[PDB]
C-alpha cells in the first residue's frame, strides 16, 4: 500500500498490511507513520533456524522512525511471528556505512565496545559488545544479529554483553 | 542571554551599513 512500488511481493505487502492494521487500531499513531518510507525489505536465513527481515529506511527518515520502533516491533512480532525485524540505513568510505548499519542494526543506540583480539595462531576475532540495556529481551536475538551482519558485510563479528552471559 | 554585537558576518554588515548611512 505505502511501499515503493517498483518491485512488490507478498511478505512486504503483508507487513505493509500490518502497518495499516496498526493504523486501523488508530488512537496512538496520530499521523506519525504517514511519513513512512521503505526502500526494500528482505528475508535472510540465519543459523538459528529462523529468519531475519531487514527493512530499509532512506535516512532522512531514520529519525522519523523514532519512538515507533518498540511498538511496531511488538506489533508485528505477534502479527507475523518468529521472525526478527531490523531497520537499516543504506547508501575512504563504506566502513562508515558498515558500522553505521551496525549501530542502527542493534537498536537506535547502545553499542559501547569494539574489541579485537589476535590469537597466537593468526586468527583474529572481533567482538562488539552492547552496554547493559534491555538484556532480557536482546539476549534472544543475539545470534540473528551477528548472522545478518556477517551476511551483510562478510566481516566475522561476534556480539557480547558485559554481564555473566 | 549574553549575545554579541559583533563576530557575525551579517551583524558586521549591518554595523558597516549603519556607518555608511549615517
Amino acid at each position: 500500500a505505502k511501499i515503493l512500488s517498483q518491485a512488490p511481493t507478498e511478505l512486504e505487502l503483508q507487513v505493509a498490511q500490518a502497518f495499516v492494521e496498526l493504523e486501523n487500531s488508530s488512537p496512538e499513531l496520530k499521523a506519525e507513520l504517514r511519513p513512512l518510507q521503505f526502500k526494500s525489505i528482505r528475508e535472510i536465513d540465519v543459523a538459528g533456524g529462523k529468519k531475519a527481515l531487514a527493512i530499509f529506511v532512506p535516512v532522512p527518515s531514520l529519525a522519523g522512525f523514532h519512538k515507533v520502533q518498540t511498538k511496531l516491533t511488538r506489533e508485528l512480532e505477534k502479527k507475523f511471528q518468529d521472525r526478527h525485524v531490523i531497520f537499516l540505513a543504506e547508501r575512504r568510505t563504506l566502513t562508515a556505512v558498515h558500522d553505521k548499519i551496525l549501530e542502527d542494526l542493534v537498536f537506535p543506540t547502545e553499542i559501547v565496545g569494539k574489541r579485537v583480539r589476535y590469537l597466537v595462531g593468526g586468527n583474529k576475532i572481533q567482538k562488539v559488545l552492547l552496554d547493559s540495556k534491555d538484556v532480557q529481551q536482546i539476549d534472544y536475538k543475539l545470534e540473528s544479529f551477528q548472522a545478518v551482519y556477517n551476511k551483510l558485510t562478510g566481516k566475522q563479528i561476534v556480539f557480547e554483553i558485559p554481564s555473566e552471559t | 542571554k549574553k549575545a554579541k554585537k559583533d563576530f557575525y558576518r551579517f551583524q558586521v554588515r549591518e554595523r558597516k551599513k549603519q556607518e555608511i548611512n549615517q
Binding site: 590469537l119 595462531g121 586468527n123 576475532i125 561476534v158 555473566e164 | -
Partner: protein
C-alpha cells in the same frame, strides 16, 4: 583446545566434535581421574568452563576476576579441582556448587603458573611465575613449605 575445543579419537583425521560456548579461545584443559566422561577447561575470557561428553555438551561456566592458567582435578574426590590463575592464589572449587571456591591457597607474589594434586589426594604442588614452587595441604589454605 585452540580457537575452540575439539574432541578427537585416534581413528579419525578430522575432529569428531566441537564443544565451545562462543567463539572464544581456550588456554588449557584437563580430564578427570575418575568419572572420566566430564572435563574442565579455562579460556582467556577469564573463564572456567565444564563439559560433559555423555551429554556431549558444555555444562556450566563461571567467570573469575583474572585468567585461569592451569586447572587440575582431584584423583580422590572426583568432583573437586584446583585452579591456578594470574591473581596470586590457587582457588579450589567444588564442582556441583560453583558459587563458592571452597578453599583459596593464598601465598605467592606473582602469577600461579601451574598446580597439581598428589595422587594421595591431599597435597597441592604449585609453581609460580616468580621463581619458586610451593607445596600446600588441602585442608589448610596457606603454604606448608617452599622450594
Amino acid at each position: 583446545g585452540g580457537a575452540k575445543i575439539h574432541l578427537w579419537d585416534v581413528n579419525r583425521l578430522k575432529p569428531v566434535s566441537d564443544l565451545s560456548w562462543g567463539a572464544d579461545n581456550i588456554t588449557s584443559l584437563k580430564f578427570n581421574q575418575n568419572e572420566t566422561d566430564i572435563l574442565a577447561s579455562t579460556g582467556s575470557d577469564n573463564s572456567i568452563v565444564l563439559y560433559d561428553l555423555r551429554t556431549n555438551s558444555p555444562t556450566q561456566k563461571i567467570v573469575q576476576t583474572m585468567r585461569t592458567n592451569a586447572i587440575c582435578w582431584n584423583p580422590m574426590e572426583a568432583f573437586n579441582f584446583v585452579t591456578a590463575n594470574e591473581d596470586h592464589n590457587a582457588y579450589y572449587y567444588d564442582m556441583r556448587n560453583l558459587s563458592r571456591s571452597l578453599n583459596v591457597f593464598k601465598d605467592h607474589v606473582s602469577a600461579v603458573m601451574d598446580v597439581d594434586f598428589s595422587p594421595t589426594g591431599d597435597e597441592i604442588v604449585t609453581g609460580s611465575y616468580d621463581k619458586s614452587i610451593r607445596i600446600y595441604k588441602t585442608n589448610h589454605g596457606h603454604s606448608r613449605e617452599i622450594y
